[PDB]
Amino acid sequence: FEEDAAQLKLGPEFENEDMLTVSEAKILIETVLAQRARETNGEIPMTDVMKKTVAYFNVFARFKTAEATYACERILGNRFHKFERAQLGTLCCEDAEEARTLIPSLANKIDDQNLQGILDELSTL
Amino acid sequence: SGKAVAKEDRTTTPYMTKYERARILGTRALQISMNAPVLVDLEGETDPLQIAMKELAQKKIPLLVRRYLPDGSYEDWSVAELI
Amino acid sequence: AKYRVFIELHLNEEIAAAFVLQKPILPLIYNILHKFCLYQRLNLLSQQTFQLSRESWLGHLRGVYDEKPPRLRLYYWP
Amino acid sequence: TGAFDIYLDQDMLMNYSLGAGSGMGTSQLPEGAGTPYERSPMVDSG
Amino acid sequence: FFLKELSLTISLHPSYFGPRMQDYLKAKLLADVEGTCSGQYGYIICVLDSNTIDIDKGRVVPGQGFAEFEVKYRAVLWRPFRGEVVDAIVTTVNKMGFFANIGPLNVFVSSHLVPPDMKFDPTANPPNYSGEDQVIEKGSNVRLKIVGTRTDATEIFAIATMKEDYLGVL
Questions:
Q1: Which residues form a coiled coil (chain E)?
Q2: Closest in B20, B78, B80 to D4, CB measured
Q3: Helix H segments across E36-158?
Q4: CATH number, position B65
């Protein structure tokens, strides 16, 4: 029935939900682990799913810091499209023309000038 | 279509019904029979039910009763509440 | 040294925290005074209980200082 | 006798008549009840 | 990646009623859902236990002696969808395509979906797909655009291409 790509299309519930960020996601994961360790015997198998994530997460640390994430958040703001948001903060770089290509759903969603300004702030961050 | 009812504004009878006693004792029986946390000083019994009855007498037994109304709403009662 | 460090520190620190708010103020300090030293009494007495339990004379008698808020169990002979 | 259902008064088992914070009697891991300087939520909300 | 609310039922056993059930229910939940995957929600990375953990119910079973505890929880899940662009980590390189890897999901980049500038070199020290200076070996995260996804047995699998602009070596 629904197996498109869009263009912002697909499951309704998932669409409604907000796509978690990469760096922020990893931070939250870390936080979660810390809360669990609070009274552990030692070990706690991380299965196979954990390993992979642990690697990908670290290999994509777009904000190796607890404040980096907050800075990023501050920089952002306007929702627009959860997906698009998390996507823009997961890719990075750099020009407008490139933004549309990656996210065609941006068509007449946002201008340019602004975009450029955001990229510069990220590169410096 | 449930609705749930206020633990403060309960309608039904404060006393425990002929049938309920029979169902509760039936229920804890199975529970204890299934090695379960017994909630009163073991008098020295053997019968997973004759024990449950020791509990009932002292109203020291878990389990609650959801009394569905015709509406579709319900009420929850505590064994210690009932009579 | 270290006692006068870490103790007096947070003492005076949260005394200043007491200045931050509407006044109790001194009586709380007066409480914490007897509090700490009498806790220290609790484990002097506990160490006494191990003066008896860890060594002479005999065992079974005890006064272990539980991790709970403070307690000393003077369990005897069976 | 089948015209009602049953659940559990967890409340009783919880507060149930009486009735601490350590972690160094062997378990290499530590603890301290739960106040060594750490939060939670907040970050999540952000 | 998403942070969503999911449900799950825990069917507890009399033996574990004790006075700290709450803990048991939580421990059982983490074990049953974490690491699992579904086509509907995808990979259930982990559950945001604490604060975001509701424990409703429950109603004991008539002929079983077990009670069912419904549980609402917040979790981090990883569900992919056709058309999404993601960074992946190349694992293997065979004259059959590119066996990348994103997080916990496995993405396969059919050779037919790779530009004609990346010839396959099996003689080169470590089998790779260079062009074209750009060299993609078993250590170079590439950018792909999911073309199609599938869900066979809770597990998910889709194919990505490198045909569009701004895709490929990273």
A1: none
A2: B20
A3: none
A4: 3.90.940.10
